[PDB]
Amino acid sequence: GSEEEIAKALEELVASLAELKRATLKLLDITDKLKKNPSESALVSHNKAIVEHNAIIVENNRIIAAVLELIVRAVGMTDEIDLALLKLKASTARLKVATALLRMITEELKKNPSEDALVEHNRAIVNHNAIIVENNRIIAAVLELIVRALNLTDEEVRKALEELKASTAELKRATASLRAITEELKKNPSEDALVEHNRAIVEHNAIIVENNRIIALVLLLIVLAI
Amino acid sequence: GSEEEIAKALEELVASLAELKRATLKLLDITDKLKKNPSESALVSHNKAIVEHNAIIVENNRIIAAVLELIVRAVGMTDEIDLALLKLKASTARLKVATALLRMITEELKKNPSEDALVEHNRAIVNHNAIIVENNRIIAAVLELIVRALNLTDEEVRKALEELKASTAELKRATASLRAITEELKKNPSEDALVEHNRAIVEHNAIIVENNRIIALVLLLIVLAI
Amino acid sequence: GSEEEIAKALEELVASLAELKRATLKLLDITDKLKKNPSESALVSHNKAIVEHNAIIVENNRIIAAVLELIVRAVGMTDEIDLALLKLKASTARLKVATALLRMITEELKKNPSEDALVEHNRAIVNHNAIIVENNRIIAAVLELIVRALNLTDEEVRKALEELKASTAELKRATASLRAITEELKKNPSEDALVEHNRAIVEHNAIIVENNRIIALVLLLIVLAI
Amino acid sequence: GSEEEIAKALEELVASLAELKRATLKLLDITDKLKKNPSESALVSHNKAIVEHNAIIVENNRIIAAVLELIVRAVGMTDEIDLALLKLKASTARLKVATALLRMITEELKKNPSEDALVEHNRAIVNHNAIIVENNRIIAAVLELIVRALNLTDEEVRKALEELKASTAELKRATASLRAITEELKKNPSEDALVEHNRAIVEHNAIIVENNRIIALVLLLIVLAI
Amino acid sequence: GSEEEIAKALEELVASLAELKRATLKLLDITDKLKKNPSESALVSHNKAIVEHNAIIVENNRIIAAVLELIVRAVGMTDEIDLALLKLKASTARLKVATALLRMITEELKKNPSEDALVEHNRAIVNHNAIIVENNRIIAAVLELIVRALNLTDEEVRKALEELKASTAELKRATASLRAITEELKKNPSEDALVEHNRAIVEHNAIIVENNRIIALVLLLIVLAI
Amino acid sequence: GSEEEIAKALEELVASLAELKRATLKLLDITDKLKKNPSESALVSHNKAIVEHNAIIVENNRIIAAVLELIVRAVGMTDEIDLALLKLKASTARLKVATALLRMITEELKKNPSEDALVEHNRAIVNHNAIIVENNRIIAAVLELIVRALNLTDEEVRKALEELKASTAELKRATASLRAITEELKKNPSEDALVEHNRAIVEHNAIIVENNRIIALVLLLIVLAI
Amino acid sequence: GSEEEIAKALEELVASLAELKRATLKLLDITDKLKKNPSESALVSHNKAIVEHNAIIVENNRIIAAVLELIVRAVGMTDEIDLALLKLKASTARLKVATALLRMITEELKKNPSEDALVEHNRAIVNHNAIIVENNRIIAAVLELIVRALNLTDEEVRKALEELKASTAELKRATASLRAITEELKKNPSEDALVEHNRAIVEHNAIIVENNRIIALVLLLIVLAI
Amino acid sequence: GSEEEIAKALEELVASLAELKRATLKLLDITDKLKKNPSESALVSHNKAIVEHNAIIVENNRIIAAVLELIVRAVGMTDEIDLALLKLKASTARLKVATALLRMITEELKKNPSEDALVEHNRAIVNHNAIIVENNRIIAAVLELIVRALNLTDEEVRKALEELKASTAELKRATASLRAITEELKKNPSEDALVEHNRAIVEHNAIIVENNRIIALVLLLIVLAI
């Protein structure tokens, strides 16, 4: 597309980030304290603020992938970029099936709510998060490819990639740790461990959002450098 | 909606109740005594204070239904609550056609005013009242559902429901009695029976307002308990 | 459509009637007396208040036909109802061409205003009225069909149809009388006969509005009975 | 097509006429007076309001021909009607090439603007007008054929044809006069004669629009009589 | 097809399930209570909400079979899978003739409505339900084949099959019970038994929809595992 | 807002405090002694001077929260301040529903006045006080945040916070003690305990007003330090 | 657009200038003197009045470009004007990405505020200023093109262009000087140099506003001359 | 609009005239004598009482044009009236750009005040006056058209038009004389000629206000004659 289409898509992107950061802060805050004990309606909506947060992350990743396509179709594909973009499309398609699965098990929780089903639902949320991390690792690979293809040596871009790589490794380590503790919850299913597992989820979602922030930065520094 | 939207809608609700209670008392007072006999212009406006009262009750029920939707869309729907809310929307739509019919026959009384048309107009007012009672019985069913879904066991709520159920049965009995006497008026149409039928209407409107008062109470006790 | 769509369309209908009755009364009042003699600009706008009234009647008939379609598509078509609805659509299409013709001859009166063209314009208004009467006779046939199909035996509906039939025959007789006097105007074209023919038009428009009032009543009694 | 399709196409037709009459009046008004002398940009847009007017006439004629096809395909073709419709299609195709030629020479005037090229452009506008007159003479022949085929003897139609024939002869005489003066401009090319030739164009466009008005009238009187 | 085609088809599938569950709930709700007795138009539309529900189930099964074909054409056919897919195509073709038969007998009920024809129509609905159960038993066989072919041993899939088999046996037992009671209705045709047979239909449709839910689940767990 | 808007809002605040301190002193004085025994009209207005005092406290808290928003929207939000301000808005919204509930139970006391309903009304006043204490604990948290964010180290501010914290802990202890004695009144309902419970209410209101005095001080010392 | 649309857009333009001149004067005044040393909250909002000023300049340039499009679409495009307008659209799109980048780095300063990040933020403000200067140089080129195309020889316009060109060269020289000193700050990062670099920014913003003033003047003199 | 809207707009008109006549008299009086010599602040506000007077004339003309539109939209447009009203709208739009230009050059006089800029500002005031005269000549043409269209032959109206025409020619002659002397000032710029040119401006403003008086009279005589 032309410059105005990319600029409109980047305004949609930065407004989506400004919405996702507020929702992240409020989800940590409602994760912080509550003395009182939950209702039956608090089973029917067990984790609704997390599934609603993940949906915003998935919508942010879809826009990032649409901007990457609009950029590359401007600067011109090469073999390796086209292979990486096709991988990115296959991963974005996988994310739709993973979302429709989480959105099914969440509604099936309206009908067999029980302390065991709550652990199944939490494991479904961990598997959705583990697939969002893959989508981000592919988008970051496509971006490093586009930056090398343009021979784009500005120090702002260099430093923004040096930050993006470290944020990607931080997100890998956090995902492996979340799956490790989720196995321990699978061994020892309890309300006591469920309460402290919900925090581990919210603290992994925080790292996802702190990675999408850098992906949007590198996208801006590229569109300004071209 | 957020807490401020429900709080604003409940301020609109309680101010509407404080207006409707004054109008109820004044409508009984102007029902109590008048020696002098009516004019021709007192045919053209035969019952205007009753139709003006019913319009306020219909406007109060619309606000109650908007608060119920804002609450349930916060605490989260379930199959039976969502079915009951859809019933409540269908009944609130029925109430609009019943109001527009009463507001047509009232204006048709400007053009064929006669001692027979006055009995038709009174029967239209009784059928409007009989449809407002249905709208209240659906709102009370939705409220008892929401209270059970929240597992809301406070004694203030328990006692407020124990009052709401008895007021609903009192209103059913009063509606059946008003239609029963309205059949006797349909048999024996006279000014003598018209005068004593108007009181039966005003004494049924009093029970409607004494029911909306308890519906607004239970709505407050719920919003304070969440 | 669902109950809320029909209820919104009936609120649009009754508000359109309350606008059309006021415009009818004011058009009779401005038909009643004026001593002073008209200008040249009173040729360029010879009957503008009548053509503006007819446009409101045509817009009211369009809404009535949209409600009839929304009702029948809820309760279910049968062979004879579907044939009658297709007739109603063909007549509502004819009414659009008749309106665009009256709205052309009215503007052609801005450019050859003369005492002869005024008689052409009055005959165009009579032919528009004669086509609105047909549209009402088809809508009334569709309504009597729907009432028989629902086996809807309430006395309120029976009496409202007994009124609708008499108003339809009154409107047939008034249309034949208006066309009869319009032939006499065609023989004896004069300002003197133009003045007394304008009243005959306004007294036929009054019967059209007194028929739409009953069509809207029967529509309400049906939607309340289902 | 069915009655509703013709009625929609006639609403498009009459709205197109109401737009074309306003554009005609404003084009005469901007033809009336201007003291000040034109710029170089007033060469680059030498006659833009005429070419923009002709485009509206061509779009009105396309809709008239689409209504004629929808009518005849309803009432049934005959040998002479089908021959005349095929002639009308060949002339409407010729009009597209004549328009694309005027729309080419107008843009070639952006690149060799000179006092000689302005006279070429004016002659191209006269040749476009001379081809629109042919399209109108074929549409008027098709209409007189359809009216005779229906044996449609109403006096409104008879008088509307008696007007259409005279307007067609008036348009023939005006086209021959415009071509005659255009030859005199071709002999004596000057700004002085260009100014008075532009008026002759605007006064021929006025007769075209005053002919399409009658073609649309006869189309309405036909669709109302069938 | 590619990953994006299956992902689009699974979004269509899960949205179709979310529409079919709402229609199931509303069909039970309109099965729950109604005091008043039906009209003649309530013969002309005797079971319309059931035939409209079955049409949605048939449209959901068509999409499930299209996803199964898109999956198997990706992972690769084998003899037994290709035989089972050809069986599935033959059953999906049979379902089209069974639907067109129900859609014929329903319209023949517009023309000989009688208490005997209502029992014929109910038996046609039972035979349609009995053929949808077969289509589900073939789709479930194809799915168990595909799962074994992929050697797909995840516990989420294992448990989802352990649920699918039990739901298939529950649906067989419910179909045999519905046919058994349909024989008793065939012996004792009455409005009294018709009312309680309609409930047996709605309670069998509920089990069909509770089976399609599990077929769509297993389809998601497969597409995520491949 | 600009300096003049904050200065006007602080003049409104200090004038509201000067009204609330006088009303507190007079409410203690009318709590001190009265020999004579109350009327029936002294049931209909059982505690009116307390509910009228609480309404003034609620209006002072509303102004404090509007000044806090005007200050922070000048000096610039940060994550933790914006979260705390949103908590403050949710609590100020909760206070409106708690007020409308107290203002309902007070008017319901006009209609079933009895020695039992008086204990219900006193418990409603205690629950309103328990919600005002929460609103103050949120405002005091927001103020300590703003003071740390400005790095505002003046000794006047430090000492004013050292007073505000101690007053907040004094108010927590007084609220827990008031609820404890209110439970004992709920066990032992008597005029004898009602008389000594009214004093406990007035002595808790005194601590609320002695806390708003310090909140208004810290607000002034902040607006003067920036 | 018509004359009223351009006149409305020029009223929006001149009101935007009257807001931007006041903000320029006040930003110099708050740049002039302050003895006291900044807080931690004075890091979180380090330059907020500059970024808020730049946003107003960007909004003024958007309106100027909308007026240029409305003017040229009235007087008629030519090759060079249409190329220059497409350049102006591409530069206005670039300005949106540059703004969203400045609005990101400013918010990232809420989370890693440090003496090094403040120098990054100051360099981001210098790069935003360097892109606004480009947008102004393109708008001034479009205006000189439109003035030559209209052959607009008035002495007010001639002198207004002679001022616009000199102001554009003054703004080029000031931008090169600001980038030169920004390199020296990049070498020698200190609070001491940050304080004197902030003045260089405010003294470049003053020249931008003193250029937008002349662009709006030439736009008025053009719209009055056509 | 209805009679009350026109009557309110004519009350606004006559109150605006009563304010403008007082301001005219006082502006002549402060133009009459002052011995003492002006300050530097008497450069920064060189002609402020004239520009403030012109703003009142422009606001009076806006109301006159709004009343003309409300009148004609009541009595009904014709081709020539509609063309003249569209001209009046284009001229009223031109007057806004001419005002915003005068209001820019007046403020630019705060920043380069010098004996040469004062002559520029006086020439800007003369060009604004020359555009108000055009707006008045269009309003007077529209009024003479409306009077002929109503065939309004009263002698009060005839004589009021006979006055309006002479006042319009007097205002044309005065404008040509003011521009003639303004050319002589442009040749011979001096304080001596500036002092005597300011009087020529004030003596032209007097004729504008003495023309608006007659336009408001004719507007009243028309609204009273219909």
GROMACS .gro file of C-alpha atoms in nm, chain C residues 9-198:
model
  190
  461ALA     CA    1  -4.229   0.057   1.355
  462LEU     CA    2  -4.564   0.106   1.528
  463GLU     CA    3  -4.419   0.394   1.729
  464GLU     CA    4  -4.310   0.549   1.398
  465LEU     CA    5  -4.661   0.483   1.266
  466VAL     CA    6  -4.852   0.644   1.553
  467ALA     CA    7  -4.618   0.945   1.560
  468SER     CA    8  -4.675   0.983   1.184
  469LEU     CA    9  -5.051   0.977   1.246
  470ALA     CA   10  -5.023   1.239   1.518
  471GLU     CA   11  -4.836   1.460   1.270
  472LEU     CA   12  -5.084   1.392   0.987
  473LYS     CA   13  -5.391   1.475   1.200
  474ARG     CA   14  -5.248   1.813   1.300
  475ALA     CA   15  -5.159   1.886   0.938
  476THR     CA   16  -5.514   1.790   0.837
  477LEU     CA   17  -5.671   2.027   1.089
  478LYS     CA   18  -5.443   2.312   0.987
  479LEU     CA   19  -5.512   2.249   0.617
  480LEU     CA   20  -5.885   2.278   0.679
  481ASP     CA   21  -5.827   2.594   0.881
  482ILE     CA   22  -5.626   2.757   0.601
  483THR     CA   23  -5.903   2.638   0.370
  484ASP     CA   24  -6.174   2.809   0.578
  485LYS     CA   25  -6.140   3.186   0.529
  486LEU     CA   26  -5.926   3.441   0.353
  487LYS     CA   27  -6.067   3.769   0.221
  488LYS     CA   28  -5.761   3.895   0.034
  489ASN     CA   29  -5.673   3.793  -0.326
  490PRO     CA   30  -5.364   3.593  -0.425
  491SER     CA   31  -5.032   3.708  -0.568
  492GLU     CA   32  -4.816   3.583  -0.855
  493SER     CA   33  -4.613   3.390  -0.597
  494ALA     CA   34  -4.952   3.244  -0.496
  495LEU     CA   35  -4.967   3.094  -0.845
  496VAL     CA   36  -4.613   2.952  -0.826
  497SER     CA   37  -4.722   2.782  -0.500
  498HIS     CA   38  -5.087   2.733  -0.592
  499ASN     CA   39  -5.168   2.427  -0.378
  500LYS     CA   40  -4.840   2.362  -0.200
  501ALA     CA   41  -5.008   2.272   0.130
  502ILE     CA   42  -5.209   1.996  -0.040
  503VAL     CA   43  -4.914   1.839  -0.221
  504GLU     CA   44  -4.720   1.857   0.106
  505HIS     CA   45  -5.014   1.685   0.279
  506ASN     CA   46  -5.042   1.407   0.020
  507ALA     CA   47  -4.669   1.342   0.060
  508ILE     CA   48  -4.728   1.275   0.430
  509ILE     CA   49  -5.012   1.035   0.353
  510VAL     CA   50  -4.790   0.847   0.105
  511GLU     CA   51  -4.517   0.822   0.370
  512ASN     CA   52  -4.768   0.691   0.624
  513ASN     CA   53  -4.889   0.423   0.380
  514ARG     CA   54  -4.528   0.316   0.321
  515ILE     CA   55  -4.480   0.251   0.693
  516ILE     CA   56  -4.810   0.066   0.723
  517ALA     CA   57  -4.698  -0.163   0.439
  518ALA     CA   58  -4.362  -0.221   0.609
  519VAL     CA   59  -4.537  -0.320   0.931
  520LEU     CA   60  -4.768  -0.554   0.740
  521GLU     CA   61  -4.465  -0.726   0.591
  522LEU     CA   62  -4.291  -0.754   0.930
  523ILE     CA   63  -4.608  -0.902   1.084
  524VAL     CA   64  -4.684  -1.153   0.810
  525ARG     CA   65  -4.322  -1.269   0.794
  526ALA     CA   66  -4.363  -1.350   1.165
  527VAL     CA   67  -4.701  -1.527   1.168
  528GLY     CA   68  -4.642  -1.707   0.838
  529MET     CA   69  -4.766  -1.655   0.485
  530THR     CA   70  -5.034  -1.850   0.304
  531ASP     CA   71  -5.119  -1.857  -0.066
  532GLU     CA   72  -5.386  -1.586  -0.050
  533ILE     CA   73  -5.190  -1.364   0.189
  534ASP     CA   74  -4.880  -1.389  -0.030
  535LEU     CA   75  -5.082  -1.297  -0.341
  536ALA     CA   76  -5.234  -1.003  -0.154
  537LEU     CA   77  -4.895  -0.883  -0.031
  538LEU     CA   78  -4.762  -0.896  -0.388
  539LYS     CA   79  -5.061  -0.690  -0.502
  540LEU     CA   80  -4.981  -0.447  -0.219
  541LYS     CA   81  -4.622  -0.418  -0.340
  542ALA     CA   82  -4.732  -0.354  -0.699
  543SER     CA   83  -4.971  -0.083  -0.580
  544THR     CA   84  -4.708   0.077  -0.357
  545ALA     CA   85  -4.478   0.087  -0.660
  546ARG     CA   86  -4.753   0.250  -0.868
  547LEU     CA   87  -4.790   0.514  -0.596
  548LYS     CA   88  -4.425   0.619  -0.642
  549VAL     CA   89  -4.473   0.694  -1.012
  550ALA     CA   90  -4.797   0.879  -0.935
  551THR     CA   91  -4.613   1.089  -0.675
  552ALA     CA   92  -4.323   1.169  -0.907
  553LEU     CA   93  -4.578   1.277  -1.168
  554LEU     CA   94  -4.756   1.513  -0.929
  555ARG     CA   95  -4.415   1.646  -0.817
  556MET     CA   96  -4.330   1.711  -1.181
  557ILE     CA   97  -4.649   1.892  -1.283
  558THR     CA   98  -4.621   2.107  -0.969
  559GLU     CA   99  -4.276   2.226  -1.075
  560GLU     CA  100  -4.382   2.272  -1.437
  561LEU     CA  101  -4.634   2.513  -1.284
  562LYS     CA  102  -4.337   2.737  -1.191
  563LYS     CA  103  -4.278   2.799  -1.563
  564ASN     CA  104  -4.617   2.822  -1.741
  565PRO     CA  105  -4.837   2.953  -1.457
  566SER     CA  106  -5.178   3.041  -1.598
  567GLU     CA  107  -5.542   2.993  -1.505
  568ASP     CA  108  -5.555   2.687  -1.733
  569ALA     CA  109  -5.248   2.515  -1.584
  570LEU     CA  110  -5.405   2.552  -1.239
  571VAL     CA  111  -5.690   2.325  -1.353
  572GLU     CA  112  -5.439   2.071  -1.482
  573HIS     CA  113  -5.264   2.077  -1.145
  574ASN     CA  114  -5.593   2.024  -0.960
  575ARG     CA  115  -5.672   1.727  -1.183
  576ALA     CA  116  -5.328   1.583  -1.108
  577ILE     CA  117  -5.404   1.615  -0.737
  578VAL     CA  118  -5.735   1.434  -0.787
  579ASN     CA  119  -5.561   1.149  -0.971
  580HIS     CA  120  -5.303   1.117  -0.694
  581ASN     CA  121  -5.583   1.100  -0.437
  582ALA     CA  122  -5.762   0.838  -0.649
  583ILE     CA  123  -5.448   0.623  -0.637
  584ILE     CA  124  -5.399   0.663  -0.261
  585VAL     CA  125  -5.755   0.538  -0.213
  586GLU     CA  126  -5.662   0.222  -0.407
  587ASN     CA  127  -5.354   0.167  -0.194
  588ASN     CA  128  -5.572   0.191   0.118
  589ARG     CA  129  -5.827  -0.054  -0.020
  590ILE     CA  130  -5.553  -0.309  -0.078
  591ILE     CA  131  -5.400  -0.259   0.267
  592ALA     CA  132  -5.745  -0.304   0.423
  593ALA     CA  133  -5.792  -0.626   0.225
  594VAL     CA  134  -5.458  -0.761   0.348
  595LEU     CA  135  -5.555  -0.676   0.707
  596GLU     CA  136  -5.891  -0.852   0.687
  597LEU     CA  137  -5.709  -1.154   0.546
  598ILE     CA  138  -5.454  -1.162   0.828
  599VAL     CA  139  -5.729  -1.129   1.088
  600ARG     CA  140  -5.920  -1.425   0.943
  601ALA     CA  141  -5.600  -1.631   0.915
  602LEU     CA  142  -5.526  -1.584   1.287
  603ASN     CA  143  -5.888  -1.674   1.378
  604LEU     CA  144  -5.867  -1.362   1.593
  605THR     CA  145  -6.216  -1.338   1.742
  606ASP     CA  146  -6.180  -1.072   2.014
  607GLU     CA  147  -6.465  -0.820   2.011
  608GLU     CA  148  -6.219  -0.528   2.001
  609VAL     CA  149  -6.084  -0.659   1.669
  610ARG     CA  150  -6.427  -0.747   1.534
  611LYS     CA  151  -6.557  -0.396   1.607
  612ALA     CA  152  -6.240  -0.236   1.468
  613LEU     CA  153  -6.291  -0.422   1.141
  614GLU     CA  154  -6.661  -0.332   1.138
  615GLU     CA  155  -6.539   0.029   1.152
  616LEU     CA  156  -6.268  -0.024   0.888
  617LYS     CA  157  -6.512  -0.165   0.630
  618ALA     CA  158  -6.756   0.124   0.671
  619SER     CA  159  -6.472   0.376   0.644
  620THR     CA  160  -6.353   0.204   0.325
  621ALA     CA  161  -6.698   0.226   0.167
  622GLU     CA  162  -6.724   0.590   0.278
  623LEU     CA  163  -6.390   0.652   0.106
  624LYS     CA  164  -6.502   0.483  -0.216
  625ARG     CA  165  -6.815   0.700  -0.228
  626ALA     CA  166  -6.610   1.013  -0.156
  627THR     CA  167  -6.363   0.931  -0.434
  628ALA     CA  168  -6.637   0.876  -0.690
  629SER     CA  169  -6.795   1.206  -0.584
  630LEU     CA  170  -6.464   1.393  -0.612
  631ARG     CA  171  -6.405   1.257  -0.963
  632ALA     CA  172  -6.763   1.344  -1.059
  633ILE     CA  173  -6.723   1.707  -0.955
  634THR     CA  174  -6.379   1.714  -1.118
  635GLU     CA  175  -6.547   1.636  -1.450
  636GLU     CA  176  -6.777   1.934  -1.393
  637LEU     CA  177  -6.472   2.153  -1.329
  638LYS     CA  178  -6.322   2.019  -1.652
  639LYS     CA  179  -6.637   2.139  -1.830
  640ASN     CA  180  -6.664   2.476  -1.650
  641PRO     CA  181  -6.309   2.597  -1.570
  642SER     CA  182  -6.321   2.908  -1.352
  643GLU     CA  183  -6.164   3.066  -1.045
  644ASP     CA  184  -6.513   3.045  -0.896
  645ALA     CA  185  -6.526   2.669  -0.943
  646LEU     CA  186  -6.157   2.629  -0.856
  647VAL     CA  187  -6.224   2.777  -0.511
  648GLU     CA  188  -6.509   2.533  -0.441
  649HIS     CA  189  -6.317   2.238  -0.589
  650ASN     CA  190  -6.023   2.297  -0.355
   0.00000   0.00000   0.00000
